[PDB]
Amino acid sequence: DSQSNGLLNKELFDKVWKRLSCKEKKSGQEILLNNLVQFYSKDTVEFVEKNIFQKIIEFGWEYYLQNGMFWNCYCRLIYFDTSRSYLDKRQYIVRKIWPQIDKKFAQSVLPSLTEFCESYFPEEMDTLEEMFTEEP
Amino acid sequence: NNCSIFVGDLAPNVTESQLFELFINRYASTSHAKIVHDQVTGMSKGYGFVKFTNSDEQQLALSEMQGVFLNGRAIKVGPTSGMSQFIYPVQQQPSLNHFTDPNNTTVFIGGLSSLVTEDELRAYFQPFGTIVYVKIPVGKCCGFVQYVDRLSAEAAIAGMQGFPIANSRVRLSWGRSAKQTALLQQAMLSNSLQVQQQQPGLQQPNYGYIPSSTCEANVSSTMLPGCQILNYSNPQQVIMQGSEAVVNSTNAMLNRLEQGSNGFMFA
Amino acid sequence: ALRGLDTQFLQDNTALVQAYRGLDWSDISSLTQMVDVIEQTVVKYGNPNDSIKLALETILWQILRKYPLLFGFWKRFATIEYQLFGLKKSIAVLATSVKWFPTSLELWCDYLNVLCVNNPNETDFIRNNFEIAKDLIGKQFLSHPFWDKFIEFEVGQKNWHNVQRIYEYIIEVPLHQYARFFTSYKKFLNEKNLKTTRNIDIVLRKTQTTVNEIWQFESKIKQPFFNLGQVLNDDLENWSRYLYHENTWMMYIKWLTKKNISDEVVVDIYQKANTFLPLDFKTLRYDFLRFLKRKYRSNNTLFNNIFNETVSRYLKIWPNDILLMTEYLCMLKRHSFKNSLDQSPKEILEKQTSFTKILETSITNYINNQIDAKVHLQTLINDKNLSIVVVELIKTTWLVLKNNMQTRKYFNLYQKNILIKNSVPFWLTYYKFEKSNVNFTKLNKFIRELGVEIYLPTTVMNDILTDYKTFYLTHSNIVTYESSIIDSNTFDPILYPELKMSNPKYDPVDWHKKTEWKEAGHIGITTERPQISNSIIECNSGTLIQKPISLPNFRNLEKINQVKINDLYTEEFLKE
């Protein structure tokens, strides 16, 4: 679709990943996370979600799992796809993202995820509420 | 008037207190008196200046002290001030309205459609400079935008003029605050004086502040002149300018775009 | 607005009705209308309503006076005098008075019986119970009042022990323990009573209101909460509100939420705070909306109607708000048309298409000025909050139904409208849609029109230009860039978003008569400064020596003292 490669170059992605590995010393962490999700394709969104986001899930670093803006950018990456339908990506985001995040780490994620859920997922509000309720 | 008299050839044992006692409280009221001493020795050179408020009392003191006994010698209290081509220019005053005040930094905005809010009107006038309040009168289709800097008000008027807000052209001018407008309305209902008051200054010099500079958000500051040292907070207090300011502003504008794409704020 | 002038007019009407010495039915109707206007415009405290209730009770209007007692109790919770007047009244009544005298008293038992000045209400209830031959009800009323910390606790206990000669010491140990607990509670509250009673004095200052003593009593009641802090905190909040304070109401709401109270009394307190406090607050309304959004998971039947009533009450008083329309649209998309992921996708797609068709029909009916009273969405859409409905329609159309030509047709249809051509989220949603596509021609058409015809706020324009400088440098090349450069308006998408940051208007490409030469040295005040037409300040003397220079041509030499000021502040705001 005449889409040229942006930040995901071999001389560019390594420089981004060398900065994102500090997690407390280098500011401008969420700026890249909001600016690495501006491609909106079928294979490029999969490429971005495979290189960094699946790797953050695999390592399980504390800073990105604690911040809810990371998961907000990750949900914004999938939800604005131009090839998928609505039901498949909605089932994807509800079923295979929200049970993956930690329940005790949701104290800083819920003020950032509640705005996204009130934004785009109106009927999925009470489902997310019953998952993060006060009693087991 | 502040008439000045120059006493000369005084004795060595005559301080400023004796000259102030001999000048003031003798059929006059001397406002100030200072004997010009040495720069590094501390001893008086025998000369002194006495500045009074009225010229007639200073003239009477100079006529009465011409030859008086001052610490064993003469006083010589003749006047110092009061056909060349070169004279200093003298001017009158514009009687201190809200147009001719250089410290007047609040802009009167009008021509609104009675539809814009206060946060949106803050968002119109936010990047021009730091701001203190954005309150508007109700039912009057106008408002008040007070900055801290005067160059920020110049930039706001030079940019925002002719800008239609909500399909209604704007009218930008000067104006007073709300309390001064209430005082002018209370003095204009009886029409006695209707006098205004000048806006207070900044107690200049101010080395740390840089005009037309905004900041929304430990601090190890080097206080270097190329960067910014101090700034006014956005409501309000005084903040030390950190290094992570453009990062916080970028995160804030990305959050503003994300919350404005959905409709959580209109500003 | 002037409550003193209304009180003086009501007193003058009462003095005229007293000096007329007759019926004066027209004057009585005018006084009743003035009292109703004063009750609707002001708080209508019991001290000013006591004379109105005495005038209504003397005019044989007890059916109207019994209805006013509930309004006087709801207006002032700490009005023990109005409760005593209501308990003294309704005695010469019909056969339901035995069901009415206690029910009007026991309802005061949970509202004003927790105060230190409630010694007369219990004595009035005991005197009302003394008329009947029920000794057990009087013994229960004496046992209930002896367990509470009142002023005359020991005298009331001695009266209950000396009056009931047949039931004096039936249960001595429990009554003695209750009296000891009441004496301990009175000795604990005596410090706050001495701090409040020795400072309450009308001197037109902060001592008459006693905000410090009320805050100390509220802090002491929040600290010693030994299973009775609810009624004591309610009495303290009523005494602090009787002596509009949003901070004390917020502290009382936080103390009620922290004590794990029921949602019904909390919703009633929220409704009483929304009714009794004046408007233009915008501090407790968003907290009540957030509490409703949090408690929608517990109940869905009453909470949706409560949120609809709150939106109807908030949109009638704040018409220029935009977050309330978003909250109403989110509640309508969550509660009315709900579809989980476990259901069939055909029903979910039909529900999304029905919601999109309902939003499109509501927008088309609001554009065509056609209202429907059966639908609340026809009423709740305002001209300020219509663009956010258009944004929700575009979002539901493009991000769910997945159609591009239909979305561009909505974009071409709803861009020429008068009301929504200068709105933030519509053009920002169009910008995000054109960012999602790979094209850049519509992006340059947007940012070139961003200061010419699309009038947006300056912060929003700076955010759009900075985001375009972020996005365009990471998703474009020189081959696309060099073809986009035109010389008619010197448009270059790398440098043009930088120069357009300061000023909203910016042209890309007779000087002495413009509006910039006149107000150069000083802004706001215009003046026509004198200049020289044939100025030789630019030509060097190596060229001026070639020929003799002509005479200087003069202009504006008749305005060296004349200056004019476009005084808008006096003419448009002072002199109207």
Curated annotation (Swiss-Prot), chain A:
Tree of life domain: Eukaryota
Subcellular localization: Nucleus
Q: Where are the HAT repeats?
A: 48-80
Q: Which residues form a coiled coil?
A: none
Q: Other remarks on record?
A: Present with 1730 molecules/cell in log phase SD medium.
Cite the record's note on assembly.
Answer: Component of the 18S U1 snRNP particle, a subcomplex of the spliceosome.
Function as written in the Swiss-Prot or TrEMBL entry: Essential component of the U1 snRNP particle, which recognizes and binds the 5'-splice site of pre-mRNA. Together with other non-snRNP factors, U1 snRNP forms the spliceosomal commitment complex, that targets pre-mRNA to the splicing pathway. U1 snRNP is cotranscriptionally recruited to intron-containing genes. Required for U1 snRNP biogenesis.
Supply the name of the protein. U1 small nuclear ribonucleoprotein component PRP42
Q: Which gene encodes it?
A: PRP42
Curated annotation (Swiss-Prot), chain B:
User: Knockout: what is the outcome?
Assistant: Affects the meiotic recombination and the formation of viable spores.
Give GO BP annotations, semicolon-separated.
Answer: mRNA 5'-splice site recognition; mRNA splice site recognition; mRNA splicing, via spliceosome; positive regulation of mRNA splicing, via spliceosome
Cellular component annotations (GO), alphabetically ordered = commitment complex; cytoplasm; cytosol; nucleus; spliceosomal complex; U1 snRNP; U2-type prespliceosome
Keywords carried by this UniProt record: mRNA processing, mRNA splicing, Repeat, RNA-binding, Spliceosome
The domain of life is Eukaryota
Domain (RRM) spans 3-82, 105-177
* MF annotations from Gene Ontology: mRNA binding
The record's disulfide annotation reads: none
Briefly state the protein's biological role.
Answer: Component of the U1 small nuclear ribonucleoprotein complex (U1 snRNP) involved in the initiation of meiotic recombination. Involved in the formation of DSBs at recombination hot-spots through meiosis-specific splicing of REC107 pre-mRNA. Collaborates with MER1 to promote splicing of essential meiotic mRNAs REC10, AMA1, MER3, HFM1, SPO22 and PCH2. NAM8 interacts with the pre-mRNA downstream of the 5' splice site, in a region of non-conserved sequence and is required for efficient splicing of uncapped RNA precursor.
Domain comment in the entry = The RNA binding domains RRM2 and RRM3 are required for NAM8 meiotic function. Within the U1 snRNP complex, the RRM2 domain of NAM8 is positioned to bind to the intronic region immediately down-stream of nucleotide +13.
Other facts noted in the record for this chain: Present with 1480 molecules/cell in log phase SD medium.
Quaternary structure note: Component of the U1 small nuclear ribonucleoprotein complex (U1 snRNP).
Q: What is this protein called?
A: Protein NAM8
Curated annotation (Swiss-Prot), chain C:
List localization entries: Nucleus
Species name: Saccharomyces cerevisiae (strain ATCC 204508 / S288c) (Baker's yeast)
Check the record and name the PANTHER family matching this protein: PRE-MRNA PROCESSING PROTEIN PRP39-RELATED, PRE-MRNA-PROCESSING FACTOR 39
Disulfide links within the chain: none
Family matches, as SUPFAM superfamilies: TPR-like (SSF48452)
What family does this belong to?
Belongs to the PRP39 family.
- The stretches annotated as HAT repeats are 51-83, 85-117, 121-156, 158-191, 216-243, 402-436
Q: What does this protein do?
A: Function prior to stable branch point recognition by the U1 snRNP particle to facilitate or stabilize the U1 snRNP/5'-splice site interaction. Has a direct role in the assembly or function of a catalytically active spliceosome.
Any one biological process term the GO annotation gives? mRNA splicing, via spliceosome
GO CC annotations on file: commitment complex; nucleus; spliceosomal complex; U1 snRNP; U2-type prespliceosome
State the name under which the record lists this protein: Pre-mRNA-processing factor 39
> Which InterPro entries did the record assign?
HAT (IPR003107), TPR-like_helical_dom_sf (IPR011990)
Q: State the remark under miscellaneous.
A: Present with 4460 molecules/cell in log phase SD medium.
Instruction: Kindly list the residue ranges recorded as spanning the membrane.
Output: none
Q: Which UniProt keywords apply?
A: mRNA processing, mRNA splicing, Nucleus, Repeat
